[PDB]
Design an enzyme around this catalytic site. Structure first.
Site, PDB file in Angstrom:
ATOM      1  N   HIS A   1       1.526  -5.835 -12.617  1.00 48.86           N
ATOM      2  CA  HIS A   1       2.732  -6.367 -11.598  1.00 48.86           C
ATOM      3  C   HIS A   1       2.892  -7.724 -12.788  1.00 48.86           C
ATOM      4  CE1 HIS A   1       3.024  -4.578  -7.753  1.00 48.86           C
ATOM      5  NE2 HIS A   1       4.233  -4.388  -8.588  1.00 48.86           N
TER       6      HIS A   1
ATOM      7  N   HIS B   1       5.202  -3.924 -17.077  1.00 43.68           N
ATOM      8  CA  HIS B   1       5.573  -2.835 -15.866  1.00 43.68           C
ATOM      9  C   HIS B   1       7.045  -3.624 -16.247  1.00 43.68           C
ATOM     10  CE1 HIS B   1       6.733  -1.596 -11.920  1.00 43.68           C
ATOM     11  NE2 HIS B   1       7.055  -2.835 -10.845  1.00 43.68           N
TER      12      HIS B   1
ATOM     13  N   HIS C   1      12.526  -7.941 -11.652  1.00 47.59           N
ATOM     14  CA  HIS C   1      13.212  -7.640 -10.856  1.00 47.59           C
ATOM     15  C   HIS C   1      11.486  -7.452 -10.168  1.00 47.59           C
ATOM     16  CE1 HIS C   1      10.360  -3.955 -12.519  1.00 47.59           C
ATOM     17  NE2 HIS C   1      10.453  -3.952 -10.837  1.00 47.59           N
ATOM     18  N   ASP C   2      10.549  -7.953 -10.463  1.00 46.79           N
ATOM     19  CA  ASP C   2       9.012  -8.582 -10.620  1.00 46.79           C
ATOM     20  C   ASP C   2       8.651  -9.852 -11.141  1.00 46.79           C
ATOM     21  OD1 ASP C   2       8.140  -6.437  -8.272  1.00 46.79           O
ATOM     22  OD2 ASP C   2       7.108  -5.179  -9.699  1.00 46.79           O
TER      23      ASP C   2
ATOM     24  N   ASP D   1      11.465   2.138 -10.869  1.00 45.67           N
ATOM     25  CA  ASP D   1      10.057   1.034 -10.555  1.00 45.67           C
ATOM     26  C   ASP D   1       8.810   2.581 -10.043  1.00 45.67           C
ATOM     27  OD1 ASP D   1       8.961  -1.109  -9.952  1.00 45.67           O
ATOM     28  OD2 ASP D   1       9.705  -1.021  -7.711  1.00 45.67           O
TER      29      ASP D   1
ATOM     30  N   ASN E   1       5.841   5.874 -13.433  1.00 46.09           N
ATOM     31  CA  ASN E   1       4.720   6.314 -12.983  1.00 46.09           C
ATOM     32  C   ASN E   1       4.057   7.623 -13.281  1.00 46.09           C
ATOM     33  OD1 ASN E   1       2.796   3.153 -12.083  1.00 46.09           O
ATOM     34  ND2 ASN E   1       4.854   3.617 -14.077  1.00 46.09           N
TER      35      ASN E   1
ATOM     36  N   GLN F   1      -3.426   8.708  -5.294  1.00 42.34           N
ATOM     37  CA  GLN F   1      -2.672   9.425  -5.975  1.00 42.34           C
ATOM     38  C   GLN F   1      -1.456  10.670  -5.408  1.00 42.34           C
ATOM     39  OE1 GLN F   1      -1.028   7.357  -8.509  1.00 42.34           O
ATOM     40  NE2 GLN F   1      -2.262   6.388  -7.728  1.00 42.34           N
TER      41      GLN F   1
ATOM     42  N   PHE G   1       0.312   9.676  -2.444  1.00 39.73           N
ATOM     43  CA  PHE G   1       1.929   8.833  -3.097  1.00 39.73           C
ATOM     44  C   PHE G   1       1.990   9.582  -3.624  1.00 39.73           C
ATOM     45  CE2 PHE G   1       3.053   6.006  -6.557  1.00 39.73           C
ATOM     46  CZ  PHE G   1       3.742   5.327  -5.800  1.00 39.73           C
TER      47      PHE G   1
HETATM   48  C1  LIG Z   1       0.099   4.420 -10.054  1.00 41.18           C
HETATM   49  O1  LIG Z   1       0.229   4.449  -9.184  1.00 41.18           O
HETATM   50  C2  LIG Z   1       0.680   3.463  -8.530  1.00 41.18           C
HETATM   51  C3  LIG Z   1       2.216   2.488  -9.124  1.00 41.18           C
HETATM   52  C4  LIG Z   1       2.853   1.852  -8.429  1.00 41.18           C
HETATM   53  C5  LIG Z   1       2.518   1.056  -7.183  1.00 41.18           C
HETATM   54  C6  LIG Z   1       3.606  -0.049  -7.082  1.00 41.18           C
HETATM   55  N1  LIG Z   1       3.308  -0.075  -5.720  1.00 41.18           N
HETATM   56  O2  LIG Z   1       3.721  -1.345  -5.131  1.00 41.18           O
HETATM   57  C7  LIG Z   1       3.340  -2.135  -3.507  1.00 41.18           C
HETATM   58  C8  LIG Z   1       3.667  -3.483  -3.617  1.00 41.18           C
HETATM   59  O3  LIG Z   1       2.971  -4.084  -4.502  1.00 41.18           O
HETATM   60  C9  LIG Z   1       3.007  -3.801  -2.271  1.00 41.18           C
HETATM   61  N2  LIG Z   1       1.965  -2.541  -1.531  1.00 41.18           N
HETATM   62  C10 LIG Z   1       0.788  -2.516  -1.898  1.00 41.18           C
HETATM   63  C11 LIG Z   1      -0.775  -2.119  -0.683  1.00 41.18           C
HETATM   64  C12 LIG Z   1      -1.945  -2.419  -1.118  1.00 41.18           C
HETATM   65  O4  LIG Z   1      -0.192  -1.731   0.776  1.00 41.18           O
HETATM   66  C13 LIG Z   1       1.387  -1.533   0.947  1.00 41.18           C
HETATM   67  C14 LIG Z   1       1.555  -1.804   2.607  1.00 41.18           C
HETATM   68  C15 LIG Z   1       2.407  -1.577  -0.485  1.00 41.18           C
HETATM   69  C16 LIG Z   1       1.642   1.891  -6.441  1.00 41.18           C
HETATM   70  C17 LIG Z   1       0.812   3.272  -7.184  1.00 41.18           C
HETATM   71  O5  LIG Z   1      -0.111   3.503  -6.215  1.00 41.18           O
HETATM   72  C18 LIG Z   1      -0.113   3.552  -5.248  1.00 41.18           C
HETATM   73  C19 LIG Z   1      -0.430   4.716  -3.532  1.00 41.18           C
HETATM   74  C20 LIG Z   1      -1.652   5.084  -4.411  1.00 41.18           C
HETATM   75  C21 LIG Z   1      -1.722   3.506  -5.056  1.00 41.18           C
HETATM   76  C22 LIG Z   1      -1.353   2.858  -5.278  1.00 41.18           C
HETATM   77 MG   LIG Z   2       4.993   0.576 -14.807  1.00 37.85          MG
HETATM   78 MG   LIG Z   3       8.322  -5.504  -7.075  1.00 37.73          MG
HETATM   79 ZN   LIG Z   4       8.371  -3.031  -9.761  1.00 42.91          ZN
END
Ligand SMILES: COc1ccc(/C=N/OC[C@H](O)CN2C[C@@H](C)O[C@@H](C)C2)cc1OC1CCCC1
Ligand SMILES: [Mg+2]
Ligand SMILES: [Mg+2]
Ligand SMILES: [Zn+2]
Ligand SMILES: COc1ccc(/C=N/OC[C@H](O)CN2C[C@@H](C)O[C@@H](C)C2)cc1OC1CCCC1
Ligand SMILES: [Mg+2]
Ligand SMILES: [Mg+2]
Ligand SMILES: [Mg+2]
Ligand SMILES: [Zn+2]
Lengths: 324, 328
Positions: B77, B81, B117-118, B235, B238, B286, B289
């Site tokens: 973040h 990003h 936004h972040d 958002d 990816n 992933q 996800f």
């Molecule tokens: C490339 O992959 C990704 C790209 C973006 C994101 C975006 N994330 O934003 C989330 C916020 O920070 C909060 N989370 C944190 C987490 C520890 O607990 C959740 C309850 C909320 C996630 C990705 O992979 C994910 C799922 C699989 C691995 C993580």
């Molecule tokens: Mg990104």
């Molecule tokens: Mg955010």
């Molecule tokens: Zn974001």
């Protein structure tokens, strides 16, 4: 002395809160909260050190503004005491847990803390720091919650120190849910949903309301504190007149700031072209009576005396307005 | 241009209109100013400086300050990003199904929202901030804690010297843009994802198009809903990117997650799902996800703009198979 005797009325609608304010040396919030916590045995139940409670209450009361005519410690004390009466309404007997009771009363006590005496819309329209912080959404109410909770951090102020982690988490959630519901922009949606809850309400044989999930429970607590917040016109006329003086003083002060800023003066904030009687009858007709008649429905007939007073006060305020 | 940073770079920025721009290359080539560079490019391309009478030096000053408030030591973040989400939103806005649908003010709102936004993200989740009784969660009453903060900072930075890029909007324009930007950034709270998607599905079901397949949006509710979902898609874009980009995004989010888990482990807290470096299944995570969040969202977006997003959906499916095939 002549304070313990007035405080004997603490379980009654129409407590002389202005007298209690005078007599306690401008500590109505502290004295009334203390009295109610003892009355409900909350110190014992939640192992609250008495010196801690008083320390918190006094610092909380200090963070209501003496120079704000309506949204001050007397209003907070009034909403606390009103909620305290409503909690004991027969239709709700043995419905709420001690934690839920504590949450409703704590929410009432903090629900307007550090109020600046101007509205959310004023804060938004003047690009205030508060509105910037809170993205124009329940600006004041978010702020009251933040300050109310923040003060628990002061020395010997954590009245919740002996709650379990689970209790503290549940209490915090309920208090937030309750104070955010005091935002008037949420009034019509709260009312619409309360009407539907009344339509489908469930009661025991004993006649008490059945609320079997968090949604229904918090909904009742939200509306209860909202009713208490909007309870001035349901009080004896001597009290209601005093509240009307104060809110009009506060409104006119905002109107003066708007006029100075070259801003369009908000409705009812122009001291030169206002009409108090007309404003109160409209307030009762379009907001306070629609809410209270729905609460009265929910707890029928518990609130009939309160509704009667409200209807009498409306008829009183309209009596000097010429009409066809 | 926009940053006195070396050479060019211009050849890479030729892809600013394409999915799979190499944003990491841009970051390097620009001396770690991808947000400033890409925002500058997009504002010039869309002629937004002229439309809204934004002085170019004011734009650059604001973008540099904004970019400085993304943390360099946060693995995911960060300013790259932000730049990515900006550029992805920019591509989505140009989709054929949306031609001439949005006003220049709405376009500005979407792009500005994407940029801020972040901002000032600390590299930990809302739930972590709540669980640790952070000052931020106290400020925002446990509700959209980060997203409220990102907005507050993004707007506050407009007040720094020579940073008010909206100074020549009318009062009404400023008010409208402010509301749209708040509505959009609050919608990036992942706790709102299921509701947001559910409503997007409803919109697709009752979708109105002209004969050329261009969306017919009737009111603010329609317009803001499409913009909210658009930026949410950006958002969560990816896994829909060229694989080499996706692989780097995965590496970065896992690094950030693991750092949070380390903080949780140190404080004796339950380690959040997918934040335990000692017990991780990165590839499996992933795929999950994609199956439960990203594909359901993008399949619905693809429906809304059919067939504009077909390639993006195909790439998503190919990338799912990459992580599937690399599960140990
Ligand atoms: C490339 O992959 C990704 C790209 C973006 C994101 C975006 N994330 O934003 C989330 C916020 O920070 C909060 N989370 C944190 C987490 C520890 O607990 C959740 C309850 C909320 C996630 C990705 O992979 C994910 C799922 C699989 C691995 C993580
Ligand atoms: Mg990104
Ligand atoms: Mg955010
Ligand atoms: Zn974001
Ligand atoms: C005794 O009478 C009252 C007791 C309490 C209240 C409670 N007020 O809370 C309101 C907030 O400050 C914000 N409003 C302020 C106003 C200037 O603009 C609105 C858009 C929002 C009002 C009373 O009567 C009032 C309203 C009707 C006539 C006078
Ligand atoms: Mg209030
Ligand atoms: Mg090329
Ligand atoms: Mg429509
Ligand atoms: Zn109040």
């Amino acid at each position: 002395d002549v304070l313990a005797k007035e405080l004997e009325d603490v379980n009654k609608w129409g407590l002389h809160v202005f007298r209690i304010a005078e007599l306690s040396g401008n500590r109505p919030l502290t004295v009334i909260m203390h009295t109610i916590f003892q009355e409900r045995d909350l110190l014992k139940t939640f192992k609250i050190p008495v010196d801690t409670l008083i320390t918190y209450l006094m610092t909380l009361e200090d963070h209501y503004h003496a120079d704000v005519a309506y949204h001050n410690n007397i209003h907070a004390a009034d909403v606390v005491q009103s909620t305290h009466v409503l909690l004991s309404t027969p239709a709700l007997e043995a419905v709420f847990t001690d934690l839920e009771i504590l949450a409703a009363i704590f929410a009432s006590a903090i629900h307007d803390v550090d109020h600046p005496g101007v509205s959310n819309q004023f804060l938004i329209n003047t690009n205030s720091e508060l509105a910037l912080m809170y993205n124009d959404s329940s600006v004041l109410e978010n702020h009251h919650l933040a300050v109310g909770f923040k003060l628990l951090q002061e020395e010997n102020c954590d009245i919740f120190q002996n709650l379990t982690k689970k209790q503290r988490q549940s209490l915090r959630k309920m208090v937030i849910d309750i104070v955010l519901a005091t935002d008037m922009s949420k009034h019509m949606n709260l009312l619409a949903d309360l009407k539907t809850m009344v339509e489908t309400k469930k009661v025991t044989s004993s006649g008490v309301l059945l609320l079997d999930n968090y949604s229904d429970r918090i909904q009742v607590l939200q509306n209860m504190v909202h009713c208490a917040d909007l309870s001035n016109p349901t009080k004896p006329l001597q009290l209601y007149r005093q509240w009307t003086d104060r809110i009009m003083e506060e409104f006119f002060r905002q109107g003066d700031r708007e006029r100075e800023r070259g801003m369009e003066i908000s409705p009812m904030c122009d001291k030169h072209n206002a009409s108090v009687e007309k404003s109160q009858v409209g307030f009762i007709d379009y907001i306070v009576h629609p809410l209270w008649e729905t609460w009265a429905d929910l707890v029928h007939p518990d609130a009939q005396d309160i509704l009667d007073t409200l209807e009498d006060n409306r008829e009183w305020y309209q009596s000097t307005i010429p009409q066809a």
